[PDB]
């Protein structure tokens, strides 16, 4: 029923359907650690969730906050040698850098060797991202592409 973990991080309570979307978006799989992932789990609290346990790995303050963008109800459990030493949780980050691409085709960030960056913004239904460079705000849903 998933696995016992010595020390690390277990992001628990990821909404079923986003667990895989996260292991891809923030390079979690790109490790040499043992990762156990449970896609589609009975939660009660939610009908189904998802769950990732990354052994011998912690997240950072901004790292976890990056998760608010796809998983506010996630819970990052910091574990040290079987004790839940930490119960971390995502606020919106003020900026996500490096993972997204600006929908503006004529933004400089495509042509030049610089990392992306977006100021995040709680608008009034979803979340809005303003590019650093072209300064155009976009719906966060749009950014997550097609």
């Amino acid at each position: 029923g998933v696995e016992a973990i010595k020390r690390g991080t277990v992001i628990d309570h990821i909404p079923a359907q986003i667990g895989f979307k996260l292991l891809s978006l923030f390079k979690l799989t790109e490790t040499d650690q043992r990762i156990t992932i449970g896609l589609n789990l009975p939660s009660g609290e939610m009908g189904r969730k998802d769950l990732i346990k990354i052994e011998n790995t912690f997240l950072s303050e901004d790292q976890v906050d990056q998760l608010a963008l796809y998983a506010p109800q996630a819970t990052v459990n910091r574990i040290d040698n079987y004790e839940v030493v930490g119960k971390s949780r995502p606020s919106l980050p003020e900026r996500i850098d490096n993972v997204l691409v600006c929908p503006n085709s004529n933004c400089i960030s495509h042509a030049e060797p610089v990392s992306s960056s977006f100021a995040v913004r709680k608008r009034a239904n979803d979340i809005a991202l303003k590019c650093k460079y072209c300064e155009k705000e976009f719906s966060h849903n749009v950014v997550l592409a097609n």
Binding site: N106, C107, I108, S109, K132, Y133, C134, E135, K136
Partner: protein
């Protein structure tokens, strides 16, 4: 040192009412009392990767009228970015080792911010990055609005034309949403309407803005009719249905207009402002262009001199 010494000028969204007010105050000083040697020994790069008449020449004339030396290019065709393949970032990196300040125009939104990441300690003044922002335009507009209407607070401002791509109206709407009780009228086609993000910013400060399908509908109420050219070059081929000025303004229309009102325009003008407006009391665009010298040279002075001019 003064509030903008060594400071980059990329977007109006990073400056305060206080910096704008200092820049116009300095502009009023320098217009009254020139300082020929004020930047005697400074060399400024004047880098235009896009077309220009007004901005590149008033900038290089303001630098010259303060003793500065200008090196640069008006076309990328013959730079190594133009023919040998280098990045903007390496242009900016080598050019930061030669000059004291970089003025740069680019076809890509974000190019001046990109160039601050590599200019080191050298400031980058944005001469227009794509359809984003054009901050020095806005300072000669504000100098001209306050020069004519006496104030920059509680003004009725109608912005007519291409608002989607108007790097000019994007910076000016942001500059005017910082003083009080300014009123906006926005008259565009749908396809080239004002950016949403701008209106949000308006909503939060609870600024009154209102769309309008006719000059005649706002004519009697406004004080500054700021007209814009359709950004022909940036239109998507889907947008080519409206390349000709939907709203064109002839002198007839000024019939029912406020004797303090001024018609402003960034220029180039094409068909939207008919040549008879040129004789009216209301036309002020060639006057606005000349204020480019004082606004532009008040900026240079503050960014490269610690000591505020008098």
């Amino acid at each position: 040192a003064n509030p903008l010494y060594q400071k980059h000028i990329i977007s109006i969204n990073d400056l305060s009412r206080d910096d704008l007010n200092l820049v116009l105050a300095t502009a009023a000083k320098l217009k009254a009392n020139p300082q020929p040697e004020l930047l005697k020994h400074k060399v400024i790069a004047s880098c235009f990767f896009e077309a220009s008449t007004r901005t590149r020449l008033s900038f290089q004339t303001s630098m010259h009228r303060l003793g500065a030396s200008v090196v640069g290019f008006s076309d990328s065709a013959n730079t190594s970015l133009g023919k040998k393949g280098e990045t903007l970032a390496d242009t900016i990196s080598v050019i930061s080792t030669y000059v004291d300040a970089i003025v740069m125009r680019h076809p890509q939104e974000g190019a001046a911010r990109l160039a601050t990441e590599f200019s080191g300690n050298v400031p980058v003044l944005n001469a227009g990055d794509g359809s984003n922002q054009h901050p020095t335009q806005t300072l000669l507009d504000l100098f001209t609005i306050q020069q004519t209407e006496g104030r920059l607070d509680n003004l009725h401002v109608a912005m007519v034309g291409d608002l989607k791509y108007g790097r000019t109206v994007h910076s000016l709407t942001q500059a005017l949403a910082k003083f009080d009780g300014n009123r906006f009228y926005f008259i565009a086609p749908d396809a080239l309407a004002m950016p949403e993000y701008i209106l949000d910013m308006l909503d939060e400060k609870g600024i009154a803005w209102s769309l309008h399908s006719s000059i005649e509908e706002v004519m009697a109420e406004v004080d500054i009719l700021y007209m814009t050219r359709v950004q022909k070059e940036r239109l998507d081929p889907s947008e080519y249905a409206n390349v000709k000025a939907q709203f064109v303004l002839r002198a007839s229309d000024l019939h029912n207009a406020k004797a303090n009102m001024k018609v402003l325009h960034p220029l180039p003008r094409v068909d939207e402002i008919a040549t008879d407006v040129d004789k009216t009391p209301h036309a002020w665009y060639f006057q606005q262009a000349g204020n480019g010298i004082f606004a532009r040279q008040a900026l240079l002075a503050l960014v490269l001199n610690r000591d505020l001019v008098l």
